[PDB]
Design a protein around this ligand. Structure first.
Ligand code: SF4
Ligand SMILES: [Ca+2]
Length: 344
DNA sequence: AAGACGGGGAC
DNA sequence: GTCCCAGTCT
């Protein structure tokens, strides 16, 4: 019932679609940026970031020529920072290798970093009219309910099933609108909890509704870590900060020297870290910070800094009024908040 | 396959 | 507390 299902979906979309920032036009660059920002992040959270980001990097070239440091700063607070490292690399790739044009071929676009099966579909269908599926969590929930699919959507292969289903029922004449409509339906009507089936424009076609299990679908299947942070203040009013490893947790972000206490030593395993030496004091406050695969049990440790050598290695000396110039994870952002809240 | 990879806002 | 959001990479 593909064709008729398409008409209802698309009709609903025209009337109910939200006027979001990235929907002003279909510029490949603007669509791509928004799609990367939306990965595992809510629309409400993205809006402010997209606005600031586009103003600061209006074109793909402008973003390509920016120093990675400024690009990360623009992403400070969004989470999953590798998304922007990959988008930056990919954008630099399109400028030099593809003459500043976002490839319109799925095989070409999919080779760029950060571009997985979802983004290929979202960006190419929307910006170029390419008939590729764009299956995100929203679509998976929608399709799972419409076709009563009970396979664990956390299974790597379950997404392939959904992609095939989309290839069979999508409006090949307007793939972009079709894909977007499917996502919007999931965002506004066919919601995680208490979907609005009575007001759904494709209720008639829904097997989950007919069987009364809409709410039980889709079917879907952390370690603690103590950490000691050090905030060394130079009598001159400058602070010590280091850039993080280029690969792994919060990669390439700045932070206050710290170590995985892995117990309860505190001001011990830290001092040792010198690879330019000094001693600490007693804590100032303790909090926690969650991620997705692990939690941080960090405890701060202040101290004084006396110069005895050149600041090298990842480390970098910086005046207090310049900190707002670096990109810091949310955890360490709080560390500094509690510090000036202390010396207050 | 399954775990790494942020931060936040409903319920 | 729990879920999951416009997922990608190894
Ligand atoms: S009828 Fe209910 S479960 Fe089926 S697609 Fe609509 S909102 Fe989703
Ligand atoms: Ca790819």
């Amino acid at each position: 019932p593909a064709r008729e299902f398409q008409r209802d979906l698309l009709d609903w979309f025209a009337r109910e679609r939200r006027d979001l920032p990235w929907r002003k036009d279909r510029d490949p660059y603007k669509v791509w940026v928004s799609e990367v920002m939306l990965q595992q992040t809510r629309v409400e959270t993205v809006i402010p970031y997209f606005e600031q980001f586009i103003d600061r990097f209006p074109t793909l070239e402008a973003l390509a020529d920016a120093d990675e440091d400024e690009v990360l700063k623009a992403w400070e607070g969004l989470g999953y920072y590798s998304r922007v490292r990959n988008l930056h690399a990919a954008v630099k790739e399109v400028k030099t290798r593809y003459g500043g044009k976002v490839p319109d071929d799925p095989d070409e676009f999919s080779r760029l970093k950060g571009v997985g099966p979802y983004t290929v579909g979202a960006v190419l269908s929307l910006a170029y009219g390419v008939p590729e599926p764009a299956v995100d969590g929203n679509v998976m929930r929608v399709l799972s309910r419409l076709f009563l699919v009970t396979d664990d959507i956390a299974k790597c292969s379950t997404r392939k099933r959904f992609e095939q289903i989309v290839r069979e029922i999508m409006a090949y004449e307007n793939p972009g609108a079709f894909n977007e409509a499917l996502i919007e339906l999931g965002a506004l009507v066919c919601t995680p909890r208490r979907p609005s089936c009575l007001l759904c424009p494709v209720q008639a076609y829904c097997q989950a509704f007919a069987e009364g299990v809409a709410e039980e679908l889709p079917v879907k299947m952390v370690k603690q870590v103590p950490l000691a942070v050090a905030v060394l203040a130079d009598d001159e009013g400058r602070v010590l900060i280091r850039k993080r490893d280029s690969t792994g947790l919060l990669a390439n972000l700045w932070e206050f020297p710290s170590c995985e206490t892995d117990g309860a030593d505190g001001k011990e395993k830290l001092e040792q870290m010198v690879g330019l030496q000094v001693e600490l004091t007693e804590p100032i406050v303790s909090f926690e910070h969650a991620f997705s695969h692990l939690v941080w049990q960090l405890t701060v440790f202040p101290g004084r800094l006396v110069h005895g050598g050149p600041v090298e290695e990842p480390y970098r000396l910086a005046p207090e009024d310049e900190l707002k110039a670096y990109a810091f994870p949310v955890s360490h952002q709080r560390v500094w908040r509690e510090y000036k809240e202390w010396a207050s």
